[PDB]
PDB file of C-alpha atoms and ligand atoms in Angstrom:
ATOM      1  CA  UNK A  28       8.396  -7.809  37.930  1.00 18.42           C
ATOM      2  CA  UNK A  29       4.604  -8.060  38.206  1.00 20.30           C
ATOM      3  CA  UNK A  30       2.487  -6.102  40.658  1.00 18.98           C
ATOM      4  CA  UNK A  31      -1.218  -6.565  41.280  1.00 21.49           C
ATOM      5  CA  UNK A  32      -3.272  -3.481  42.229  1.00 22.62           C
ATOM      6  CA  UNK A  33      -6.814  -4.580  43.028  1.00 20.22           C
ATOM      7  CA  UNK A  34      -7.895  -0.989  43.635  1.00 22.84           C
ATOM      8  CA  UNK A  35      -8.020  -0.575  39.850  1.00 21.56           C
ATOM      9  CA  UNK A  36     -11.066  -2.878  39.935  1.00 23.27           C
ATOM     10  CA  UNK A  37     -13.084   0.240  40.769  1.00 26.55           C
ATOM     11  CA  UNK A  38     -12.631   1.414  37.174  1.00 23.03           C
ATOM     12  CA  UNK A  39     -14.676  -1.616  36.106  1.00 22.69           C
ATOM     13  CA  UNK A  40     -17.113  -2.119  38.989  1.00 23.99           C
ATOM     14  CA  UNK A  41     -18.254   1.527  38.832  1.00 26.13           C
ATOM     15  CA  UNK A  42     -19.611   0.632  35.365  1.00 26.48           C
ATOM     16  CA  UNK A  43     -21.274  -2.549  36.624  1.00 28.14           C
ATOM     17  CA  UNK A  44     -18.625  -4.480  34.663  1.00 25.37           C
ATOM     18  CA  UNK A  45     -15.604  -6.736  35.216  1.00 23.88           C
ATOM     19  CA  UNK A  46     -12.295  -6.869  33.357  1.00 25.22           C
ATOM     20  CA  UNK A  47      -8.509  -6.655  33.396  1.00 27.41           C
ATOM     21  CA  UNK A  48      -6.026  -3.991  32.413  1.00 29.57           C
ATOM     22  CA  UNK A  49      -2.394  -4.977  31.934  1.00 29.88           C
ATOM     23  CA  UNK A  50       0.316  -2.294  31.657  1.00 28.09           C
ATOM     24  CA  UNK A  51       4.006  -2.779  30.818  1.00 31.62           C
ATOM     25  CA  UNK A  52       6.672  -0.096  31.463  1.00 33.07           C
ATOM     26  CA  UNK A  53       9.220  -0.753  28.745  1.00 28.91           C
ATOM     27  CA  UNK A  54      12.067   1.276  30.315  1.00 27.22           C
ATOM     28  CA  UNK A  55      11.671  -0.418  33.718  1.00 25.53           C
ATOM     29  CA  UNK A  56      10.640  -3.865  32.388  1.00 26.40           C
ATOM     30  CA  UNK A  57       7.820  -3.995  34.942  1.00 29.22           C
ATOM     31  CA  UNK A  58       4.186  -5.036  34.549  1.00 30.45           C
ATOM     32  CA  UNK A  59       1.052  -3.949  36.406  1.00 32.48           C
ATOM     33  CA  UNK A  60      -2.465  -5.364  36.479  1.00 30.46           C
ATOM     34  CA  UNK A  61      -5.667  -5.368  38.539  1.00 28.10           C
ATOM     35  CA  UNK A  62      -6.146  -9.141  38.218  1.00 27.13           C
ATOM     36  CA  UNK A  63      -3.217 -11.499  37.702  1.00 30.10           C
ATOM     37  CA  UNK A  64      -5.503 -14.474  37.071  1.00 30.61           C
ATOM     38  CA  UNK A  65      -7.573 -12.821  34.349  1.00 28.78           C
ATOM     39  CA  UNK A  66      -4.441 -11.263  32.841  1.00 33.96           C
ATOM     40  CA  UNK A  67      -3.400 -14.845  31.951  1.00 32.59           C
ATOM     41  CA  UNK A  68      -6.819 -16.225  30.905  1.00 33.05           C
ATOM     42  CA  UNK A  69      -7.140 -16.849  27.188  1.00 31.75           C
ATOM     43  CA  UNK A  70      -9.958 -15.376  25.099  1.00 29.81           C
ATOM     44  CA  UNK A  71     -10.790 -15.248  21.427  1.00 29.63           C
ATOM     45  CA  UNK A  72      -8.739 -12.380  19.929  1.00 31.52           C
ATOM     46  CA  UNK A  73     -11.543 -11.307  17.564  1.00 33.07           C
ATOM     47  CA  UNK A  74     -10.591  -8.126  15.686  1.00 34.70           C
ATOM     48  CA  UNK A  75      -7.298  -7.723  17.600  1.00 35.23           C
ATOM     49  CA  UNK A  76      -6.334 -10.546  15.217  1.00 36.96           C
ATOM     50  CA  UNK A  77      -6.306  -7.944  12.470  1.00 37.68           C
ATOM     51  CA  UNK A  78      -2.751  -7.050  13.669  1.00 39.79           C
ATOM     52  CA  UNK A  79      -1.130 -10.453  12.899  1.00 37.41           C
ATOM     53  CA  UNK A  80      -3.425 -10.983   9.912  1.00 35.74           C
ATOM     54  CA  UNK A  81      -2.225  -7.681   8.361  1.00 38.36           C
ATOM     55  CA  UNK A  82       1.417  -8.578   9.013  1.00 36.35           C
ATOM     56  CA  UNK A  83       1.093 -11.930   7.299  1.00 37.88           C
ATOM     57  CA  UNK A  84      -0.910 -10.591   4.348  1.00 37.06           C
ATOM     58  CA  UNK A  85       1.733  -7.884   3.724  1.00 37.54           C
ATOM     59  CA  UNK A  86       4.716 -10.157   4.123  1.00 36.73           C
ATOM     60  CA  UNK A  87       3.363 -12.736   1.689  1.00 39.60           C
ATOM     61  CA  UNK A  88       2.278 -10.160  -0.895  1.00 41.07           C
ATOM     62  CA  UNK A  89      -1.448 -10.781  -0.397  1.00 42.32           C
ATOM     63  CA  UNK A  90      -1.549  -7.027   0.322  1.00 41.52           C
ATOM     64  CA  UNK A  91       0.852  -4.939  -1.742  1.00 41.73           C
ATOM     65  CA  UNK A  92       0.820  -1.794   0.427  1.00 40.74           C
ATOM     66  CA  UNK A  93      -1.418   0.433   2.574  1.00 38.69           C
ATOM     67  CA  UNK A  94      -2.929   2.115  -0.506  1.00 35.91           C
ATOM     68  CA  UNK A  95      -4.198  -1.000  -2.317  1.00 30.28           C
ATOM     69  CA  UNK A  96      -7.983  -0.806  -2.576  1.00 29.84           C
ATOM     70  CA  UNK A  97     -10.115  -3.765  -1.493  1.00 30.26           C
ATOM     71  CA  UNK A  98     -13.342  -3.323  -3.415  1.00 28.40           C
ATOM     72  CA  UNK A  99     -16.674  -3.822  -1.643  1.00 26.12           C
ATOM     73  CA  UNK A 100     -18.208  -7.118  -2.801  1.00 25.71           C
ATOM     74  CA  UNK A 101     -21.631  -5.470  -3.116  1.00 29.08           C
ATOM     75  CA  UNK A 102     -23.255  -7.463  -0.312  1.00 25.46           C
ATOM     76  CA  UNK A 103     -25.107  -5.134   2.015  1.00 27.83           C
ATOM     77  CA  UNK A 104     -24.012  -5.778   5.602  1.00 29.05           C
ATOM     78  CA  UNK A 105     -25.442  -4.339   8.786  1.00 31.30           C
ATOM     79  CA  UNK A 106     -22.386  -2.133   9.508  1.00 30.84           C
ATOM     80  CA  UNK A 107     -22.705   0.820   7.140  1.00 31.36           C
ATOM     81  CA  UNK A 108     -18.957   1.585   7.073  1.00 32.06           C
ATOM     82  CA  UNK A 109     -18.313  -1.924   5.724  1.00 35.30           C
ATOM     83  CA  UNK A 110     -20.415  -1.271   2.589  1.00 31.53           C
ATOM     84  CA  UNK A 111     -17.645   0.570   0.811  1.00 33.31           C
ATOM     85  CA  UNK A 112     -14.148   0.258  -0.592  1.00 33.53           C
ATOM     86  CA  UNK A 113     -11.261   0.084   1.885  1.00 31.56           C
ATOM     87  CA  UNK A 114      -7.496   0.127   2.033  1.00 30.29           C
ATOM     88  CA  UNK A 115      -5.471  -1.381   4.868  1.00 28.96           C
ATOM     89  CA  UNK A 116      -5.706   1.840   6.938  1.00 25.75           C
ATOM     90  CA  UNK A 117      -9.489   2.223   6.775  1.00 23.74           C
ATOM     91  CA  UNK A 118     -10.040  -1.538   7.057  1.00 25.64           C
ATOM     92  CA  UNK A 119      -8.163  -1.505  10.377  1.00 28.67           C
ATOM     93  CA  UNK A 120      -9.942   1.678  11.484  1.00 30.26           C
ATOM     94  CA  UNK A 121     -13.486   0.311  10.842  1.00 33.61           C
ATOM     95  CA  UNK A 122     -12.578  -3.295  11.791  1.00 35.52           C
ATOM     96  CA  UNK A 123     -13.831  -4.522   8.420  1.00 35.53           C
ATOM     97  CA  UNK A 124     -14.180  -8.259   9.004  1.00 34.44           C
ATOM     98  CA  UNK A 125     -15.067  -9.214   5.390  1.00 37.11           C
ATOM     99  CA  UNK A 126     -11.821  -7.685   4.004  1.00 34.70           C
ATOM    100  CA  UNK A 127      -9.773  -9.663   6.538  1.00 34.01           C
ATOM    101  CA  UNK A 128     -11.753 -12.851   5.841  1.00 32.35           C
ATOM    102  CA  UNK A 129     -10.591 -12.654   2.213  1.00 31.14           C
ATOM    103  CA  UNK A 130      -6.972 -12.014   3.374  1.00 30.21           C
ATOM    104  CA  UNK A 131      -7.149 -15.237   5.428  1.00 28.92           C
ATOM    105  CA  UNK A 132      -8.480 -17.257   2.475  1.00 31.37           C
ATOM    106  CA  UNK A 133      -5.568 -16.089   0.307  1.00 28.04           C
ATOM    107  CA  UNK A 134      -3.035 -16.769   3.082  1.00 29.19           C
ATOM    108  CA  UNK A 135      -4.428 -20.276   3.476  1.00 27.83           C
ATOM    109  CA  UNK A 136      -4.296 -22.635   6.465  1.00 28.94           C
ATOM    110  CA  UNK A 137      -0.745 -23.892   6.119  1.00 27.28           C
ATOM    111  CA  UNK A 138       0.913 -20.471   5.879  1.00 30.01           C
ATOM    112  CA  UNK A 139      -1.345 -18.943   8.564  1.00 32.91           C
ATOM    113  CA  UNK A 140      -0.521 -21.719  11.020  1.00 32.30           C
ATOM    114  CA  UNK A 141       3.193 -21.496  10.296  1.00 28.87           C
ATOM    115  CA  UNK A 142       3.289 -17.722  10.763  1.00 25.69           C
ATOM    116  CA  UNK A 143       1.356 -17.695  14.026  1.00 28.92           C
ATOM    117  CA  UNK A 144       3.809 -20.242  15.361  1.00 25.10           C
ATOM    118  CA  UNK A 145       6.692 -18.033  14.187  1.00 23.92           C
ATOM    119  CA  UNK A 146       5.029 -15.124  16.054  1.00 24.14           C
ATOM    120  CA  UNK A 147       4.520 -17.201  19.253  1.00 24.12           C
ATOM    121  CA  UNK A 148       0.947 -15.828  19.017  1.00 23.38           C
ATOM    122  CA  UNK A 149      -1.388 -17.042  21.771  1.00 25.49           C
ATOM    123  CA  UNK A 150      -2.134 -20.734  21.577  1.00 26.47           C
ATOM    124  CA  UNK A 151      -1.120 -20.624  17.859  1.00 29.14           C
ATOM    125  CA  UNK A 152      -4.165 -22.808  17.061  1.00 26.03           C
ATOM    126  CA  UNK A 153      -6.163 -22.023  13.929  1.00 22.19           C
ATOM    127  CA  UNK A 154      -8.654 -24.916  14.263  1.00 20.15           C
ATOM    128  CA  UNK A 155     -11.975 -23.883  12.759  1.00 20.41           C
ATOM    129  CA  UNK A 156     -12.752 -22.222   9.451  1.00 21.37           C
ATOM    130  CA  UNK A 157      -9.831 -20.433   7.856  1.00 21.74           C
ATOM    131  CA  UNK A 158     -12.011 -17.363   7.268  1.00 20.56           C
ATOM    132  CA  UNK A 159     -13.414 -17.116  10.812  1.00 23.20           C
ATOM    133  CA  UNK A 160     -11.245 -18.971  13.344  1.00 24.26           C
ATOM    134  CA  UNK A 161     -10.393 -15.741  15.208  1.00 21.49           C
ATOM    135  CA  UNK A 162     -14.132 -15.153  15.683  1.00 19.01           C
ATOM    136  CA  UNK A 163     -15.373 -18.669  16.467  1.00 19.05           C
ATOM    137  CA  UNK A 164     -12.515 -21.167  16.137  1.00 19.89           C
ATOM    138  CA  UNK A 165      -9.952 -22.503  18.575  1.00 23.21           C
ATOM    139  CA  UNK A 166      -7.434 -19.654  18.700  1.00 20.95           C
ATOM    140  CA  UNK A 167      -6.998 -17.984  22.094  1.00 23.69           C
ATOM    141  CA  UNK A 168      -4.742 -15.328  23.589  1.00 21.13           C
ATOM    142  CA  UNK A 169      -4.367 -13.658  27.005  1.00 19.72           C
ATOM    143  CA  UNK A 170      -3.781 -10.008  27.812  1.00 22.45           C
ATOM    144  CA  UNK A 171      -0.186 -10.765  28.893  1.00 21.90           C
ATOM    145  CA  UNK A 172       0.379 -12.687  25.660  1.00 21.65           C
ATOM    146  CA  UNK A 173      -0.927  -9.676  23.722  1.00 20.21           C
ATOM    147  CA  UNK A 174       1.746  -7.540  25.436  1.00 18.64           C
ATOM    148  CA  UNK A 175       4.475 -10.033  24.507  1.00 18.62           C
ATOM    149  CA  UNK A 176       3.430 -10.029  20.837  1.00 14.63           C
ATOM    150  CA  UNK A 177       3.099  -6.237  20.685  1.00 15.08           C
ATOM    151  CA  UNK A 178       6.547  -5.693  22.208  1.00 14.82           C
ATOM    152  CA  UNK A 179       8.083  -7.728  19.387  1.00 17.22           C
ATOM    153  CA  UNK A 180       6.146  -5.675  16.833  1.00 17.62           C
ATOM    154  CA  UNK A 181       7.243  -2.375  18.390  1.00 14.90           C
ATOM    155  CA  UNK A 182      10.890  -3.510  18.227  1.00 13.90           C
ATOM    156  CA  UNK A 183      10.583  -4.937  14.645  1.00 15.75           C
ATOM    157  CA  UNK A 184      11.527  -8.382  16.017  1.00 14.75           C
ATOM    158  CA  UNK A 185       8.753 -10.437  14.485  1.00 14.08           C
ATOM    159  CA  UNK A 186       9.776 -12.888  11.740  1.00 12.04           C
ATOM    160  CA  UNK A 187       8.456 -10.754   8.885  1.00 11.53           C
ATOM    161  CA  UNK A 188      10.166  -7.860   7.124  1.00  9.10           C
ATOM    162  CA  UNK A 189      10.787  -4.489   8.786  1.00  9.45           C
ATOM    163  CA  UNK A 190       8.577  -2.910   6.083  1.00  8.90           C
ATOM    164  CA  UNK A 191       5.605  -5.139   6.944  1.00  5.94           C
ATOM    165  CA  UNK A 192       5.941  -4.191  10.642  1.00  5.96           C
ATOM    166  CA  UNK A 193       6.248  -0.460   9.922  1.00  5.33           C
ATOM    167  CA  UNK A 194       3.143  -0.566   7.709  1.00  9.74           C
ATOM    168  CA  UNK A 195       1.043  -2.329  10.345  1.00  8.54           C
ATOM    169  CA  UNK A 196       2.183   0.085  13.043  1.00  7.36           C
ATOM    170  CA  UNK A 197       1.144   2.932  10.753  1.00  5.67           C
ATOM    171  CA  UNK A 198      -2.281   1.287  10.359  1.00  2.00           C
ATOM    172  CA  UNK A 199      -2.617   0.946  14.158  1.00  2.00           C
ATOM    173  CA  UNK A 200      -2.324   4.722  14.646  1.00  2.00           C
ATOM    174  CA  UNK A 201      -5.323   5.723  16.807  1.00  2.00           C
ATOM    175  CA  UNK A 202      -4.547   9.039  18.519  1.00  2.00           C
ATOM    176  CA  UNK A 203      -1.729  11.568  18.534  1.00  2.70           C
ATOM    177  CA  UNK A 204      -1.176  14.988  20.156  1.00  2.00           C
ATOM    178  CA  UNK A 205       1.631  17.007  21.712  1.00  2.00           C
ATOM    179  CA  UNK A 206       1.671  14.686  24.761  1.00  2.00           C
ATOM    180  CA  UNK A 207       1.458  11.109  23.473  1.00  2.00           C
ATOM    181  CA  UNK A 208       0.788   8.751  20.588  1.00  2.00           C
ATOM    182  CA  UNK A 209      -1.447   5.673  20.841  1.00  2.00           C
ATOM    183  CA  UNK A 210      -1.100   2.771  18.422  1.00  2.00           C
ATOM    184  CA  UNK A 211      -3.739   0.118  19.150  1.00  2.00           C
ATOM    185  CA  UNK A 212      -6.547  -2.147  17.927  1.00  2.00           C
ATOM    186  CA  UNK A 213      -9.997  -2.817  19.411  1.00  2.00           C
ATOM    187  CA  UNK A 214     -11.730  -6.178  19.524  1.00  2.00           C
ATOM    188  CA  UNK A 215     -15.295  -7.354  20.169  1.00  2.00           C
ATOM    189  CA  UNK A 216     -15.934 -11.087  20.691  1.00  2.00           C
ATOM    190  CA  UNK A 217     -19.574 -12.289  20.719  1.00  2.00           C
ATOM    191  CA  UNK A 218     -19.708 -15.775  19.156  1.00  2.00           C
ATOM    192  CA  UNK A 219     -18.252 -17.668  22.108  1.00  2.00           C
ATOM    193  CA  UNK A 220     -18.948 -17.058  25.769  1.00  2.00           C
ATOM    194  CA  UNK A 221     -18.040 -14.948  27.618  1.00  2.00           C
ATOM    195  CA  UNK A 222     -18.625 -11.989  25.346  1.00  2.00           C
ATOM    196  CA  UNK A 223     -15.780  -9.457  25.742  1.00  2.00           C
ATOM    197  CA  UNK A 224     -14.298  -6.279  24.365  1.00  2.00           C
ATOM    198  CA  UNK A 225     -10.553  -5.796  23.917  1.00  2.00           C
ATOM    199  CA  UNK A 226      -8.223  -2.858  23.477  1.00  2.00           C
ATOM    200  CA  UNK A 227      -4.528  -3.616  22.957  1.00  2.00           C
ATOM    201  CA  UNK A 228      -1.579  -1.426  21.914  1.00  2.00           C
ATOM    202  CA  UNK A 229       0.848   1.065  23.394  1.00  2.00           C
ATOM    203  CA  UNK A 230       1.424   4.687  24.361  1.00  2.00           C
ATOM    204  CA  UNK A 231       4.544   6.409  22.998  1.00  2.00           C
ATOM    205  CA  UNK A 232       6.001   9.156  25.178  1.00  2.00           C
ATOM    206  CA  UNK A 233       9.102  11.266  24.545  1.00  2.00           C
ATOM    207  CA  UNK A 234      11.335   8.941  26.599  1.00  2.00           C
ATOM    208  CA  UNK A 235       9.380   5.685  27.300  1.00  2.00           C
ATOM    209  CA  UNK A 236       6.737   3.353  25.899  1.00  2.00           C
ATOM    210  CA  UNK A 237       3.868   1.851  27.897  1.00  2.00           C
ATOM    211  CA  UNK A 238       2.251  -1.258  26.414  1.00  2.00           C
ATOM    212  CA  UNK A 239      -1.319  -2.115  27.364  1.00  2.00           C
ATOM    213  CA  UNK A 240      -3.849  -4.867  26.924  1.00  2.00           C
ATOM    214  CA  UNK A 241      -7.329  -4.868  28.390  1.00  2.00           C
ATOM    215  CA  UNK A 242     -10.416  -6.982  28.099  1.00  2.00           C
ATOM    216  CA  UNK A 243     -13.801  -6.602  29.776  1.00  2.00           C
ATOM    217  CA  UNK A 244     -17.160  -8.274  29.853  1.00  2.00           C
ATOM    218  CA  UNK A 245     -19.396  -6.933  27.078  1.00  2.00           C
ATOM    219  CA  UNK A 246     -22.932  -8.375  27.443  1.00  2.00           C
ATOM    220  CA  UNK A 247     -24.242  -5.845  24.859  1.00  2.00           C
ATOM    221  CA  UNK A 248     -22.721  -3.491  22.317  1.00  2.00           C
ATOM    222  CA  UNK A 249     -23.814  -0.492  24.430  1.00  2.00           C
ATOM    223  CA  UNK A 250     -20.610  -0.696  26.500  1.00  2.00           C
ATOM    224  CA  UNK A 251     -18.081  -0.769  23.669  1.00  2.00           C
ATOM    225  CA  UNK A 252     -16.883   2.783  24.335  1.00  2.00           C
ATOM    226  CA  UNK A 253     -15.782   1.723  27.818  1.00  2.00           C
ATOM    227  CA  UNK A 254     -12.898  -0.254  26.318  1.00  2.00           C
ATOM    228  CA  UNK A 255     -10.941   2.926  25.562  1.00  2.00           C
ATOM    229  CA  UNK A 256     -12.525   5.064  28.301  1.00  2.00           C
ATOM    230  CA  UNK A 257     -11.507   2.796  31.162  1.00  2.00           C
ATOM    231  CA  UNK A 258      -8.027   2.236  29.721  1.00  2.00           C
ATOM    232  CA  UNK A 259      -7.428   5.961  29.406  1.00  2.00           C
ATOM    233  CA  UNK A 260      -8.706   6.461  32.981  1.00  2.00           C
ATOM    234  CA  UNK A 261      -6.152   3.968  34.255  1.00  2.00           C
ATOM    235  CA  UNK A 262      -3.442   5.685  32.193  1.00  2.00           C
ATOM    236  CA  UNK A 263      -4.405   9.060  33.668  1.00  2.00           C
ATOM    237  CA  UNK A 264      -4.487   7.661  37.218  1.00  2.00           C
ATOM    238  CA  UNK A 265      -0.973   6.268  36.718  1.00  2.00           C
ATOM    239  CA  UNK A 266       0.332   9.625  35.359  1.00  2.00           C
ATOM    240  CA  UNK A 267       1.157   8.083  31.992  1.00  2.00           C
ATOM    241  CA  UNK A 268      -1.056  10.609  30.184  1.00  2.00           C
ATOM    242  CA  UNK A 269      -2.432  13.910  31.474  1.00  2.00           C
TER     243      UNK A 269
HETATM  244  C1  L5D B 323     -22.790  -3.878  17.239  1.00  2.00           C
HETATM  245  C2  L5D B 323     -21.603  -4.417  16.478  1.00  2.00           C
HETATM  246  C3  L5D B 323     -21.598  -5.717  16.005  1.00  2.00           C
HETATM  247  C4  L5D B 323     -20.510  -6.217  15.313  1.00  2.00           C
HETATM  248  C5  L5D B 323     -19.412  -5.412  15.074  1.00  2.00           C
HETATM  249  C6  L5D B 323     -19.388  -4.095  15.522  1.00  2.00           C
HETATM  250  C7  L5D B 323     -18.262  -3.188  15.177  1.00  2.00           C
HETATM  251  C8  L5D B 323     -17.933  -2.927  13.845  1.00  2.00           C
HETATM  252  C9  L5D B 323     -16.910  -2.052  13.523  1.00  2.00           C
HETATM  253  C10 L5D B 323     -16.180  -1.439  14.523  1.00  2.00           C
HETATM  254  C11 L5D B 323     -16.472  -1.694  15.855  1.00  2.00           C
HETATM  255  C12 L5D B 323     -15.635  -1.074  16.947  1.00  2.00           C
HETATM  256  O1  L5D B 323     -15.978  -1.297  18.126  1.00  2.00           O
HETATM  257  O2  L5D B 323     -14.632  -0.392  16.604  1.00  2.00           O
HETATM  258  C13 L5D B 323     -17.516  -2.561  16.174  1.00  2.00           C
HETATM  259  C14 L5D B 323     -20.489  -3.618  16.238  1.00  2.00           C
END
């Protein structure tokens, strides 16, 4: 069911980095990783938390639909793309933390905790501030746990409406061409050691789906592009994409 291929470590070491890629072949129900231990180590989810947060906000009516505009609060932040109005699609695309912080405040602690437990999401622990626990609170999730959560979302099996799940999967759309479709979310965790980058999601093919979850050490922001680059290099090596 699980196979470890340590040769994939070269994809990280060649960039003077360390990390884990986890792949899951949905048709065969088989998983693959370069590091079984790190595949099951729990990290802060950071902006990968925008997936469950969106689901909950939609299902409770905090967000009406993917067109609703969240107005910029007029506070200049250091990420230029955050200093503007957003809807759910662009907020996911530009990982707009302050929009999702307001979602969490409107959800509130009790409902957030209850929903994460319903989702079986990571350690299901929201200790910390309700508007930042996924950045510097107690919540943790592993790469294999990301796969488990994403498989439920793909199959519309989470305990929210089908509509909420379809909308979030629309918002996860990252890349599409004649060969494949990628639905995914990046993450970047800096407030708690070790600093890491995430990329989690799946690749849709004509006749199969491959789920993936990766994290890697990220001592500075200069390496952020390696999150997708390394993942796609593994996918190409494994003949999942050309
Ligand atoms: C340098 C820095 C610091 C804090 C957040 C980010 C950021 C902001 C928005 C998107 C991304 C990203 O990777 O997709 C990264 C960058």
